[PDB]
């Protein structure tokens, strides 16, 4: 009787393939970190509505990062920081402007899929990787599991909430 399997305690684990992790952000800061330690490093940070330009500290893969953050929208902003190699620097790759405070991540087809854009029109976008199987994630917030075959429902949630 459930589409939303959960919510699950924040944890570190290797998610199975073909399942959306629907992560519910409670407060500002790091929402999750994920990597395979080879070619894929991503971390999403959450900035609350109506935040003028300010400097904030975030721990990413055990590294202190100081980012300047701006949020002029009435919605929350979820910024994806990405790098593709050990010696690389992190850069902003994607932005999700959402008033539902939900992000999503899926491992499928040899790629990592997330949501970005502005709700209720957010869409999925892919990141190529040569080692999907070794990708793990530390989720800092409670989360749900939806099968990829029910991605439509996941979409709706991310775009409209509960």
């Amino acid at each position, epitope marked *: 009787g459930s589409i939303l399997d959960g919510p699950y305690q924040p944890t*570190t*684990f*290797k998610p199975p393939n073909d399942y959306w992790l629907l992560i519910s952000s409670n407060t500002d800061g790091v929402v999750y*970190e994920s*990597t*395979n*330690n*080879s*070619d894929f490093w991503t971390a999403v940070i959450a900035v609350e509505p109506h935040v003028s330009q300010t400097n904030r500290q975030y721990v990413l*893969f*055990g*590294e*202190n990062k100081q980012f300047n953050v701006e949020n002029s929208s009435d919605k929350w902003k979820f910024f994806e920081m990405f790098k*593709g*190699s*050990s*010696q*690389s*620097d992190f850069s902003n790759r994607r932005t999700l402007t959402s008033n539902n405070r939900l992000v999503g991540m899926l491992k499928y087809g040899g790629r990592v899929w997330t949501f970005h854009g502005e709700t209720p029109r957010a869409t999925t976008d892919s990141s190529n990787t*040569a*080692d999907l*199987n*070794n990708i*793990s994630i*530390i989720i800092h917030s409670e989360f749900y599991i939806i099968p990829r075959s029910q991605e439509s429902k996941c979409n709706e949630y991310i775009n409209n909430g509960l």
Partner: single-chain antibody, 235 residues
Framework: SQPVLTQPPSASASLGASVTLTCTLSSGYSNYKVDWYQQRPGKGPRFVMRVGTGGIVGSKGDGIADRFSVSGSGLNRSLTIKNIQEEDESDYHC?????????????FGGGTKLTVLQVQLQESGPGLVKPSQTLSLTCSVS??????????WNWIRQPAGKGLEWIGR???????NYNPSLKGRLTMSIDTSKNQLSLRLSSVTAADTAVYYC???????????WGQGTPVTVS
């Protein structure tokens, strides 16, 4: 192994003074980060600090005193020790990652001998091995489950020349990266259920005489974790 790390063989310092050990990158790698390692007398290496051109990256290692700072500019990467104690007399090693995915390699400096005026890894081996035979090493891990999936496990040897040599790394799935300098003589395995890491090196020669170390690399932290190594002497 495109980048080259240059460390002076020896450095000297007096008690209570300051000294700066340096590691110089080859041209074209000004953005690269390097790890510093401290190998105390009668011990194997331990992690010290990671530094790029913007200072320290991540946390410093366990047991590293606040007298240890770290900096970088241009191709220079520096480990500075102030108010030097005699326990600071040690060998100091420079390491750096290069590449991603299939072409990954780890390069090391020659090492600098400074003279002063949780997760546990245990490596086991034969001790003595005859040439042309196959060297079989194991390493037991006790801090974590090898089926967790958030660790990369490296093997690093210290052969003739006294500088560290990265030989390979294995991931939880069993995927591997080997050093090309070893041909295909090196196979690395992971035993999920026995929590064990295993290594085979075919057709060994005097060039393979070395101390072999297993190094845990947690996905979400900077400091390494070393076993204390297994001596291997090729007949």
């Amino acid at each position: 192994s495109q980048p080259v790390l240059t460390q002076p063989p020896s450095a000297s310092a007096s008690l209570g003074a300051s000294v700066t050990l340096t590691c110089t990158l080859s041209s074209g790698y000004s953005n690269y980060k390097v790890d510093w390692y401290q190998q105390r007398p009668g011990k194997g290496p331990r992690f010290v600090m990671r530094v790029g051109t913007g200072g320290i990256v991540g946390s410093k290692g366990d047991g590293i005193a606040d007298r240890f700072s770290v900096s970088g500019s241009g191709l220079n990467r520096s480990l500075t020790i102030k108010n030097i104690q005699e326990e600071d007399e040690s060998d100091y090693h420079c390491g750096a990652d290069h590449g991603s995915g299939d072409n990954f390699v780890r390069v090391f400096g020659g090492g600098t001998k400074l003279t002063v005026l949780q997760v546990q890894l245990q490596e086991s081996g034969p001790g003595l091995v005859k040439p042309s035979q196959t060297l079989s090493l194991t390493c037991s891990v006790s801090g974590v489950s090898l089926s967790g999936g958030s660790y990369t496990w490296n093997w690093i040897r210290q052969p003739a020349g006294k500088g560290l040599e990265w030989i390979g790394r294995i991931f939880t799935s069993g995927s591997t990266n080997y050093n090309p300098s070893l041909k295909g003589r090196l196979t690395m395995s992971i035993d999920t259920s026995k929590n064990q890491l295993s290594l085979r090196l075919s057709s060994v020669t005097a060039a393979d005489t070395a101390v072999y170390y297993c190094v845990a690399d947690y996905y979400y932290s900077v400091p390494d974790v070393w076993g204390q190594g297994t001596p291997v002497t090729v007949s």
